[PDB]
A paper describes a structure:
CCs are quaternary structures comprising two or more α-helices supercoiled around each other with cyclic (Cn) or dihedral (Dn) symmetry. Here, we describe variants with all combinations of the aliphatic residues, Ile, Leu and Val, at a and d to give four classes of peptide: the ββ class, with a and d = Ile or Val; Lβ, a = Leu and d = Ile or Val; βL, a = Ile or Val and d = Leu; and LL, a = d = Leu. Peptides are named systematically appending the one-letter code for the amino acids at the a and d sites to “CC-Type2-“; e.g., CC-Hept becomes CC-Type2-LI. In summary, solution-phase data and X-ray crystal structures demonstrate conclusively that different classes of Type-2 coiled-coil (CC) peptides—i.e., based on abcdefg repeats with predominantly hydrophobic residues at a, d, e and g—adopt a range of distinct states.
By contrast, those of the βL class and peptide CC-Type2-LL showed weak or non-specific binding of DPH. And LL sequences form collapsed structures. Surprisingly, the X-ray crystal structure of CC-Type2-LL-L17E overlaid almost perfectly with that for the parent CC-Type2-LL; i.e., all six Glu-17 side chains are completely buried within the core of the assembly. However, the cognate structure for each sequence did not always have the lowest score, as apparent from the off-diagonal white and blue points. This occurs for all of the LL-based sequences and those βL sequences observed to form collapsed structures. For these, we propose that the collapsed states are adopted as they lead to more hydrophobic burial and contacts.
Residue numbers in the entry:
A (entry chain C), D (entry chain C): 1 to 29
B (entry chain B), C (entry chain A), E (entry chain B), F (entry chain A): 1 to 30
Write the structure that this text describes.
């Protein structure tokens, strides 16, 4: 219910955080 | 539940971490 | 309940980190 | 059982992470 | 359980984040 | 199980962030 929806919301953020990390990795070379 | 409520505040905080890192990334690229 | 308040707390921790990294980011772009 | 022990292990790390954050805050002033 | 196993790998990662931030803190203080 | 692999994944995310911040830290101390 309300928790399966909260869980994909965490899934989205987790992807978002990865993308930012690749951007910062890129920025450090 | 209140667990779900928790996961919701964590997803919100991850998102702001993600934004901050992109901000930091750009700060360094320029 | 066992776990909810531990994940809520990790959310505040990351939120603080995000603010921390915006300040760092600001310091570096000047 | 094994999960109540894992949970205080997360509790410890959470404290540890806070302490590092105050150190970095300190470092930025 | 496998949930507990998860919380264990998260506590381990928080600890290394904590170390990295202190490393970053010192990098800036000097 | 629902949640385990999401928290395991957040652990890898933070581990990567910690490595990211060690590199940043190294870049700044020279």
């Amino acid at each position: 219910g309300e928790l399966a929806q909260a869980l994909k919301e965490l899934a989205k953020a987790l992807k978002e955080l990865a993308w930012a990390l690749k951007e910062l990795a890129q920025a450090l070379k």
